[PDB]
Design an enzyme around this catalytic site. Structure first.
Site, PDB file in Angstrom:
ATOM      1  CG  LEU A 259      -2.152  -1.032   1.122  1.00  0.00           C
ATOM      2  CD1 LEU A 259      -3.129  -0.535   1.924  1.00  0.00           C
ATOM      3  CD2 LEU A 259      -2.431  -1.370  -0.250  1.00  0.00           C
ATOM      4  CG  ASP A 260      -0.682   5.117  -1.301  1.00  0.00           C
ATOM      5  OD1 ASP A 260      -1.091   5.969  -0.526  1.00  0.00           O
ATOM      6  OD2 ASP A 260      -1.145   4.686  -2.430  1.00  0.00           O
ATOM      7  CB  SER A 261       1.605   7.699   2.928  1.00  0.00           C
ATOM      8  OG  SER A 261       1.260   8.534   1.787  1.00  0.00           O
TER       9      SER A 261
END
Ligand SMILES: CCCCCCCCCCCCCCCCCC(=O)OC[C@H](COP(=O)(O)OCCN)OC(=O)CCCCCCCCCCCCCCCCC
Ligand SMILES: CCCCCCCCCCC[C@H](O)CC(=O)SCCNC(=O)CCNC(=O)[C@H](O)C(C)(C)COP(=O)(O)O
Ligand code: SF4
Ligand code: SF4
Ligand code: SF4
Lengths: 115, 155, 115, 176, 85
Positions: free
Chosen positions: E39-41
């Site tokens: 995932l990402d932030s």
């Protein structure tokens, strides 16, 4: 030159911190706006669309600029939830009436003499 | 024959429709005050048999009078939508006709017909009060030359 | 014999007069045409909310006031009684109490209803 | 200088308060209104009988444009191109071309009635009084297309209203 | 019935793999969001929108930057709600 004014955030860290909860608000609203504005789109395409305009400008490094879109983006969620905008004002983001624009080099060349 | 009978019946509906329309002037700009000026005792629409009626569910003809902007655009269309049939829109002034003096600005749609099916185009900036009165007269002449019942007879 | 016959005739006259006002004009309603009209703009979903107290307060005062006046309809035949003095005193009582109810209601704000 | 508009001194004598009580009880000022409008009814109206009679106008009236021509009949227009340069709405479009004689006039004089605003600057701009704008105002229509006047339409209209505008500028050019 | 730590675990993982871009085979106890779960932030701003509707609560943003793995969520609700097993 390099030294400059913190309009709202010193550092890019708190810039996302302003992006985060605003995205949370810009995530939460979808079921109620889709309900009372009486649209036809589903909630999920509203959700992933919210991602879409969160994406195109996810490439700037200046803290002032990014949090300027934060207040800029802060400026429609209430324009929507207090039913100020119209159905024509949020289908506008759902660009639908135009035919798909050309992507390949061949398609531009066929259509006309314009890059 | 049936053609003669339906012709009389069409005329009977025709005569009232051309003499009992109640306009709703969607007051937009300097064109609107002129329409109030042809409400003055000088011209007095009501002597023809038309009354300035609000609640556009009662009106028959609606008059766009002035410039029309994008902000005004979607609401103005909805006024046209629940406006009951028969419904006619008269373009008052150059700005409502084809954008007029602001035809090139970023915020006004060039011409009102881009939103509604304009029936009569009245030129003017502003059209002098009796020039609009002329346009209303043209509306009744056009209303006189319809074949609603006649077309249904051949339908 | 004639009374409800007179009542009967008017109701049929009204019903046919709306009947030929309903089927004759060849109803051609659409969705936007039947949409509610709200000064030409979008309705936000309403007409299902309570309205404070002032409209209710005046209604009850009217109801109470209407009940006292109900007590004093028979005055025209009351004047034809044998003992006027008792009738004169008694009818005056209803009116002054009607005054007193108005008097109190005036003094303790009341008719200056809430805002 | 100045003057006050609502400094009112209601005299508190027993006389004056009687009028105030009379004013409130008997709707005297309201009756003043009734007799006021009644006098208006008993007057004539001023509704002009259009189209059997129309409004009073002036020789300087600005109406529908119409290109004129000389007494010889050749078009006054020489394509100096002043009118579109001052035209505040850019409703005047025109392109000049060589002519067979050499009196190279325009092949295009298209004035968009739905863009033009009838300031009359074109008349003042034209050095040969070619484009004037006539006294007519009945030039309404039902389709947006017929308001995009072209060189032919102006020339025809100029030949139509030539009887009128010729006298209008005759009786007004001294002012101009 | 107090919400058990295992119950915190299964509820936390449940909607986490109801989220579109989380694969339940890849989902595990140590399902790190950016590295393991990929995932990402900002992607993290989805599953916190997704955990809220389980127990009917709210949590601030001052902690949203420390729960990168399901146990971090699981322990955090346990201490802040003060319910254990
Ligand atoms: C004959 C011999 C006697 C002659 C009369 C003498 C007495 C005169 C009294 C005059 C009225 C009382 C004094 C006064 O000026 O009161 C003014 C005041 C105005 O009230 P208001 O307009 O609401 O503004 C203030 C509050 N916001 O008033 C008030 O606030 C009072 C409101 C009272 C409401 C009820 C009043 C009576 C209603 C009609 C009663 C029936 C008719 C009279 C019956 C009399 C029986 C004795
Ligand atoms: C129905 C719809 C109506 C209309 C709905 C409209 C919704 C609101 C849109 C508001 C404008 C804008 O898109 C979002 C704003 O608020 S501000 C600018 C964001 N730009 C940056 O932050 C640049 C730097 N980039 C990063 O910080 C990370 O990339 C990020 C956190 C974004 C993603 O993280 P990842 O990558 O891990
Ligand atoms: S056409 Fe002329 S008078 Fe009418 S609204 Fe536009 S600018 Fe004003
Ligand atoms: S009056 Fe003449 S100069 Fe002015 S806008 Fe109209 S055409 Fe152009
Ligand atoms: S009409 Fe007059 S101002 Fe316009 S181009 Fe011709 S000569 Fe010039």
């Amino acid at each position: 030159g390099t030294s400059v004014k913190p309009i709202f955030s010193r550092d890019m860290n708190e810039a996302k911190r302003r992006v985060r909860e605003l995205y949370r608000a810009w995530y939460r609203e979808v079921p109620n706006t889709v309900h009372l504005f009486q649209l036809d789109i589903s909630v999920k395409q509203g959700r992933d669309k919210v991602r879409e305009m969160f994406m195109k400008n996810a490439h700037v490094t200046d803290p002032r600029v990014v949090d300027l879109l934060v207040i800029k983006g802060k400026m429609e969620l209430e324009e929507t939830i207090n039913v100020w905008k119209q159905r024509t004002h949020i289908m506008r983001f759902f660009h639908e009436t135009e035919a798909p624009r050309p992507t390949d080099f061949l398609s531009k060349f066929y259509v006309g003499h314009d890059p | 024959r049936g053609e003669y009978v339906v012709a009389k019946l069409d005329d009977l509906v025709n005569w009232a429709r051309r003499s009992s329309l109640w306009p709703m002037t969607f007051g937009l700009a300097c064109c609107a005050v002129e329409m109030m000026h042809m409400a003055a005792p000088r011209y007095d629409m009501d002597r023809f048999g038309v009354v300035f009626r609000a609640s556009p569910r009662q009106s028959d003809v609606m008059i766009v009078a002035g410039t029309l902007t994008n902000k005004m655009a979607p609401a103005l269309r909805k006024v046209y939508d629940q406006m009951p049939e028969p419904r006619y829109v008269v373009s008052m002034g150059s700005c409502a006709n084809g954008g007029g003096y602001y035809h090139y600005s970023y915020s006004v749609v060039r011409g009102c017909d881009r939103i509604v099916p304009v029936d009569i185009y009245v030129p003017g900036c502003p059209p002098t009060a009796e020039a609009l009165l002329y346009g209303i007269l043209q509306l009744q002449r056009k209303i006189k030359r319809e074949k609603r019942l006649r077309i249904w007879y051949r339908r | 014999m004639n009374i409800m016959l007179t009542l009967l005739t008017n109701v049929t006259l009204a019903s046919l007069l709306v009947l030929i006002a309903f089927w004759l004009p060849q109803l051609n309603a659409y969705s936007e045409k039947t949409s509610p009209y709200e000064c030409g703009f979008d309705p936000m979903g309403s007409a299902r909310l309570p309205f404070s107290m002032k409209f209710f307060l005046v209604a009850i005062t009217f109801l109470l006031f209407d009940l006292e006046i109900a007590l004093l309809l028979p005055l025209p035949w009351a004047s034809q009684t044998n003992n006027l003095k008792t009738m004169l005193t008694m009818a005056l009582f209803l009116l002054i109490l009607l005054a007193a109810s108005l008097a109190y209601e005036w003094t303790q704000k009341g008719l200056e209803w809430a805002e | 200088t100045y003057k006050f508009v609502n400094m009112r001194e209601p005299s508190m004598d027993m006389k004056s308060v009687t009028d105030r009580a009379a004013q409130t009880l008997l709707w005297t000022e309201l009756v003043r209104g009734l007799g006021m409008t009644l006098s208006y009814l008993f007057r004539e109206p001023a509704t002009i009988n259009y189209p059997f009679e129309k409004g009073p106008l002036s020789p300087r009236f600005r109406g529908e444009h119409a290109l004129r021509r000389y007494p010889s009949g050749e078009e006054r227009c020489i394509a100096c191109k002043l009118c579109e340069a001052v035209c505040p709405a850019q409703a005047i479009t025109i392109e000049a071309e060589p002519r067979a004689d050499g009196s190279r006039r325009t092949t295009r004089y298209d004035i968009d009635m739905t863009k033009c605003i009838y300031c009359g600057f074109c008349q003042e701009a034209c050095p040969v009084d070619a484009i004037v704008e006539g006294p007519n105002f009945e030039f309404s229509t039902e389709t947006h297309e017929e308001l995009l006047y072209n060189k032919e339409k102006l020339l025809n209209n100029g030949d139509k209203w030539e009887a009128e505008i010729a006298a209008n500028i005759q009786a007004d050019y001294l002012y101009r | 019935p107090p919400l058990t730590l295992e119950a915190i675990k299964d509820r936390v993982l449940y909607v986490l793999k109801l989220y579109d871009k989380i694969d339940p085979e890849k989902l595990s106890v140590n399902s790190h969001f950016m590295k393991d779960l990929g995932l990402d932030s900002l992607d993290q701003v989805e599953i916190i929108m997704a955990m809220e509707d389980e127990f009917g609560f709210e949590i601030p943003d001052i902690d949203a930057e420390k729960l990168m793995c399901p146990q971090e969520i699981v322990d955090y609700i346990a201490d802040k709600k003060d319910v254990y097993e």
